[PDB]
RNA sequence: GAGCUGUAAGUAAGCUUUGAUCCAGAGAUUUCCGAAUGGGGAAACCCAGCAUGAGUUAUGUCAUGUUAUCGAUAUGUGAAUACAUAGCAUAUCAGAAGGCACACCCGGAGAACUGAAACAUCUUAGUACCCGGAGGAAGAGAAAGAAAAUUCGAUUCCCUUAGUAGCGGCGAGCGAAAUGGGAAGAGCCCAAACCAACAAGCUUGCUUGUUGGGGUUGUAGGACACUCUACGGAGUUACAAAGGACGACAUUAGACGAAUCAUCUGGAAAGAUGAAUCAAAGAAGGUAAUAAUCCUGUAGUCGAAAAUGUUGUCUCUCUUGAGUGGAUCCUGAGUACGACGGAGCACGUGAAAUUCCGUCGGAAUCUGGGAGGACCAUCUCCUAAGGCUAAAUACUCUCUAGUGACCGAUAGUGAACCAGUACCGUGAGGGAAAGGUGAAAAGCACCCCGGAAGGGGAGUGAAAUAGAACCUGAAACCGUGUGCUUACAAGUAGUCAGAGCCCGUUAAUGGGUGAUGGCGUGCCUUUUGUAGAAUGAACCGGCGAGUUACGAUUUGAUGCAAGGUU
């Protein structure tokens, strides 16, 4: 996914952060609560959350470098 | 007599033959040979060192 | 390097000399499966989707070394090389030319 | 954080006798204290919480495949909402 | 380049030719503890301060930074005291700490058992163990040398010299060096004279000071005084140092890569047999048994985004070299030496030179000074009291690539197995045992007995007394059957002699049993002497003890011989 979350803005990389962070809290709540039945949806949202902070992190390594 | 390195790779892979340089003959590959094949410039070179 | 769509031939085994594709091939300890060869005979209990059931006759595992493919001129099986063709790697028949095997 | 610090609910026949009161039992990381337990779950479920408790359980021995462990150490909170509810299934 | 979601099975969810999983290069993240450094503390936890930030009506809470100690640099301020310093104050720097294979190396400290057949000098031994240092090596290193020739020309290491010289209750025992043969193989810089400024005392001149130049040596050098000469050289390993450019290979992923079929036996062939083929590949490992031609490979060849690694050439940076005269000046002071007390030198304080330490003494200036194993004298050699220096050398926790008349599971690391682990100890510390189904899990569907375990079938498989304690399964031991024997007999359990009753062999003047007769007090170790009531062994199985290096001497053998040998 490491090509549309460079397309975002810097100020959407940290929306769709905490977009996929509610979405990784909702199904790692009810995978508790016993109705999920489709587990490989968690770790692809743990590692989108990955792309998106590497990338929001050499922003501000490139941002930091020139300056 | 001296080495040569087409006879010492077109030699290499068949199991039982060897090929030597005439100074560096020793006691233990004559002997395991059956029989000798030495060139006219190696016959001169062994018969010189050799006696 | 046998591919999972090939039509090979076996060399050892109960069955040689037989025909029969590919099915998997099970590459982390090179033990391909061709439909028809090696059938295994098992003893399954019953189970929470299926019946009890006798014997299951399914294929079992062959080794890659005991399969070798065919020539598409002689029918005669054969070894495989290389070759580089617009950058891509394609397989020589080692006897012939190119074998073509996409599935 | 806010959510980091929330891990599971705890669904046990202790805990429904609970949610015939208003008290819901979750499974909290083991490093918060029960204020941001309670400023975390008003800011996840828009409750109003009147208490919360908190308790450790330590690591509980187990052996599975006859090769001896420990369980992880776990943190426990019980937030006691005032009006509101937490919709479970 | 087609599968993948660790070992690790599974399922369930999925992901992948739009190239996943994996393989390298680079990067991001990197909880807490720990030198742990905000404070504390029983390490992996508590409690903060400050400054921002979020939140809240506000607190409470939370986030992010920043706060140990000396150290360095700054400016504040300046006590007893008047200046001044102490000291406090902030503000920068992050310098130190800790760790190791710390194996090797260099220092500081430094035993004892033992040997001398006791033992004190001596030896063990500057060994072990502690400390402190460091480095990829360290240390040493450019003659106040070794020597005594028509001498050599930094150090280190190797061969000899040589168990020689010598030391030593001249006991035990220690134990060189030079020459010669080799590896490797470069020398430098400073203090001082003097000169230049500069700055202050000071009196304008001198002194001191910094800085710069200068110049570093015995064939006496250099200042000086002369004459004659310049950017060619030199190079980050010493000799002063930074950092480019462009290449070169070097690793850190890889990619090609020759050539076989048939029949027989088998569960399976790579074996046998028959006919081929490749070889710059007949190394090796797999594949249902023993494969150059089935597979992975090998020979050979090719390859690098990116990372470093060396290494060239430019760039760049530094830089005059000689000669004569030596009149004068300089050439390393509480130093060298001396005494006393020690240590080190192979050398035990001695005929002790030479090298250090403590304590006091205490020099010389080229017509100088030192050394040549006491001391003089004479010759000869060298120039102390400043410093730096690669290589040849040591070591392997490791990494990469390999090797073995090395181990095969009581061996080989303690550890082939989720080992310094169960376990033991309050603690340091001590420390195991435990590999093998099959080719393939095809791991026994069903039936019967049984609560279950277990079995008996059936079934898989070449084999199931290959059934998961699973390759072979030896003895001790435990059994069940039996053929011959045995209930009047005194026994080291046999041994000859033998009737009877069974049996039939690696077929030969056979095998099993034994009515009865004759003879007969185990085995080791120890002893003058053991049935010994002397020792040792419950039994069985494994393990379990004259080896190796170096020297010496003898024979044996073989070279060739007044020579033989490296
Ligand atoms: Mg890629
Ligand atoms: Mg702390
Ligand atoms: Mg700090
Ligand atoms: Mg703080
Ligand atoms: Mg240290
Ligand atoms: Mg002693
Ligand atoms: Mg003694
Ligand atoms: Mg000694
Ligand atoms: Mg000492
Ligand atoms: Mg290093
Ligand atoms: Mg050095
Ligand atoms: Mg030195
Ligand atoms: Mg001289
Ligand atoms: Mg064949
Ligand atoms: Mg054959
Ligand atoms: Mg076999
Ligand atoms: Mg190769
Ligand atoms: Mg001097
Ligand atoms: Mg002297
Ligand atoms: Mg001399
Ligand atoms: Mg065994
Ligand atoms: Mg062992
Ligand atoms: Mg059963
Ligand atoms: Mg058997
Ligand atoms: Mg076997
Ligand atoms: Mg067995
Ligand atoms: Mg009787
Ligand atoms: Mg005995
Ligand atoms: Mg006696
Ligand atoms: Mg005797
Ligand atoms: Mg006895
Ligand atoms: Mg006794
Ligand atoms: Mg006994
Ligand atoms: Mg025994
Ligand atoms: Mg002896
Ligand atoms: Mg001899
Ligand atoms: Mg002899
Ligand atoms: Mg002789």
Redesign the pocket.
Known sequence: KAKEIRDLTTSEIEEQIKSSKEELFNLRFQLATGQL????????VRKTI?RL??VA??RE?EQSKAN | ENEDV?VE???????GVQVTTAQGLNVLDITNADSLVITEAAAKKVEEVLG | ?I??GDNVKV???????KEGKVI????????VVVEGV?????????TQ?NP?????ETE??????????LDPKTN?????????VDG??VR?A??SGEEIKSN | ?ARDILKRPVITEKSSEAMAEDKYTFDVD????K??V??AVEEIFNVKVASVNIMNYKPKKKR??????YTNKRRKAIVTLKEGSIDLF
């Open positions: 039945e489709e587990t490989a949806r968690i770790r692809t990955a902070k590497t992190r050499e390594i | 087409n790779l077109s030699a290499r892979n068949i199991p | 390097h591919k999972k060399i050892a085994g109960k069955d040689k000399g998997a091939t099970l590459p982390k300890k090179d033990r090696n059938i295994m005979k098992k003893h399954q209990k019953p989707l009890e059931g006798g014997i299951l079992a595992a062959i080794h890659v070394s005991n399969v070798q493919l005669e099986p054969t070894r495989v090389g290389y070759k580089f891509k790697k020589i080692k006897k | 954080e083991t490093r918060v204290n204020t941001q309670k400023m599975m495949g006859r090769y001896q462990g």
